[model samples]
Target: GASKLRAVLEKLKLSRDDISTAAGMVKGVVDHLLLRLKCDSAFRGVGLLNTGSYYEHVKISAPNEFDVMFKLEVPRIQLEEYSNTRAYYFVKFKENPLSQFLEGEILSASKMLSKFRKIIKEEINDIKDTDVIMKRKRGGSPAVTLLISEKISVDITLALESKSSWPASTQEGLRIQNWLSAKVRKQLRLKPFYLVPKHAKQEETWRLSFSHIEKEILNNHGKSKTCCENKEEKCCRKDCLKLMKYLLEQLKERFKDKKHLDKFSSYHVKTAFFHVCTQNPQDSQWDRKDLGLCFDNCVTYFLQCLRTEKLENYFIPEFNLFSSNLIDKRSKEFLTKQIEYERNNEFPVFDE
Candidate 1:
């Protein structure tokens, strides 16, 4: 059973050539944006952060999708909580040094995103390569996506990096002290959190994103610094994440038209994986030799969350990932059953 599972996971891993090609195309887009941002007065001192599973090395299946955040440094801004959800905020640019960049007194997320999209589109037109095209903007999406060779899609997001303290909701969250030491947690807390031009209700509101910090956590996951070092024996932490992502993808494919299942994403799995890591909190628990057992335990934990209907956001515990608004009870039950079947049968879903 473990052999079959390992074989399936090995096959799901992207090939060297595939990864290189995707990286090259993604870099081309990033380079173009960085050049424009550097030359444009409006985007002076802006930074580009590479994000998403591709950068984290947890991306499964084809390496066709990528995410990059073009971050603008904002100073002297007051973040007001927009809704009950702690992740959303309304940024007020009080005593902003870069007031010249803003269209209004307050930071306008919609206006900024529109301007950034226009710039990206204009830059794409100037590029000599005909293979790259700016895709039509999707409703409620914060990304200015580009299609490369009509196969790969890269989401270039406009974001604001704030040095302000994290929200009250995240105080008890990101519980990695047990798994990755109190010192590491302190260092991560010192890092800045980001606000992207994303809002569910209001146009000017922003959504918090910790992709950079998340990348850091995933990169240095172990309690010891040399957890997955070349000299040290490998761990199955990343492998477990990969398997979970793959499993989610398979389930999504099977229920392509189901709106309820659509809300469940790789983020949920990633969050659960983090919680599992903290729960086990030992390198020996995720030994490479016990990959199958570790994976099964992770899946069991995820199923438990689904059954309990309480999958909290890893960063914001106040936000229930499997909320009824996103997924109904029936959908939750279906997912739980499907996952249970897959686990019991050694993931027959991957056989396809």
Candidate 2:
């Protein structure tokens, strides 16, 4: 089992040059977009942050996907739980707007994105080679994504950065206790949290994002100091995650027409990865030779989440990722079966 999984991983893993080659092309395009935003008065303060599988070092795509966060620092404000699920919030400022995108006390995400999209449209016209196909999907993240002549896809997400306490929903989440130290948790909480535009019933609802912390945790995932260090004591923690991510990606490809499958992104895989790591926190348990066992843990954990329909967001525990609203019963059941078959049958889908 271990050798079989190892062979699959050997085939799946990416090299530094492979990622860097794709990295160079996207950087120039992203740089152009950032500069354009800077020149424009409304977006002069926007900052770029790299977040995604590649940035997190668990490469997923041959074509490559870039998830860039263009963050705007907002003055401290009020957060109202948008719904029962506290993952989404209504960001209201105190008695607000000489502010560019403020509607009464609310920061208007749609209004902000309107202009943000406009500047991008004009600026991307200059780049010209990539065909500037800004793929703005209906639901999901509020990112103005583009395809590099269909070679690479970049998601340009606008996030509001606030140096304040996290939302009330996150008071008990990210339980990395057995995995990492209390000090690390405290330090992360001290850092800022970001709110990205996530369109909902009300006008300006922002989805809480902790992609920054997610990257940090995954990059330094281990109890021991030498977790994924030299070969003397290598761990399969990350490799297990990469395998799961690849399996999910391949499964989606096989069921491409089933639009509901879109609901399950790599983030889901990573969230489960983070949870399982904490549940079974020990590098000794994740020895390089035990990759198959580690991978099975991730599969079973995710399957359990899917079966029970309780896969909450890792940061915001209240946010049910398998929410009935997000993914319907039919699709959820369908995907549950699909994942189980792949797992039980030696992941024949992955062989392709």
Candidate 3:
């Protein structure tokens, strides 16, 4: 059964030559846009933060999708929680900041994003060589989707960079003591946190993003040093992660028209992957030859997260990624059944 899955990964994972080519193309576009964004007085301090699974090296199939954050620098801010979940917040400018982006003292995410989109459209006319078409913003997505050359896309989000203290909501999050150590965790907390313009309920509210830390953890994932150096030290952690990502993609693709399936995102899978890492922190636990059992463990853990409908955000303990608001109960029930069926049947959907 694992042999078949290994075959699936071989077909799903991107080739090295392909990755470099895609990266070059992506870098060109992002670079052009970044220079354009910097010229504007409003977006002067904008810094590019390459994020998402593509950068994390777990992206499967084509390297068509990219997530980039345009980090707009901001002063000290106060965070007020919007819901009991503790994931969403209304960021107040404690240090007094830019115009057209504030509602009273609270920074309005929707407003800023709308302006960001406008500026991008204005600058896009001068973008050379690429047939850049800005996809119309969907109702719930925080990203301003850009379809470049029809094959590649860049999902850009406006993020505020704050060096302020970590939020109280995340007091018990990122439980990686056995995996990454307390000192390393403390060092990370001292770094900055990004506030992406994510508004599910209130348009002014922002969602906390620890993508940089998440990237760091994934890259340095071995309990023992030198893991993933080669087959000798190589563990199947990334392989298993890519498999789950591919599995979710295939499952979602099979039901493209099902709007309920829309709730499932790559973040859900990544968060689950992080949890599984802490659970089995030892490098030997993910031996290269043991991908089958490793993947089984990941899938089983994923199923439980789906079944209980409480997939907590890896960095924010109180916030559930699979919340009732994000994913409907019916959708969870349906996806749970779908996963069990797929797993029991040896994931026949991977044929595509």
TM-score of each: 0.92, 0.92, 0.92
lDDT of 1 at 310: 86
Q: Report how far residue 25 has shifted in candidate 1, in Å.
A: 1.2
Local distance difference test values of all predictions, in order: 0.78, 0.79, 0.80
> Which of candidates 2 and 3 reaches a greater lDDT?
3
Best by lDDT: 3
What does candidate 2's lDDT look like per residue over 2-27, in tens digits? 77677777776545566778888888
Better of 1 and 2 by TM-score: 2
Which candidate, 1 or 3, has the higher lDDT?
3
Deviation of model 3 at 249, angstroms: 1.0
Runs in model 1 deviating more than 4 A are 95-105, 130-140, 230-232, 257-260
Give the clashing pairs for model 1: none
Give one digit per residue, the lDDT tens place, for model 1 in 128-179: 5523445544432545777766777777777788887887778988888889
Task: Kindly list the per-residue Cα lDDT of model 3 for residues 49-146, writing each as its tens digit.
Answer: 87777678776656686767788888777888886758788888653436667878777777777777778877777776554455655532445766
**TM-score, cand. 2:** 0.92
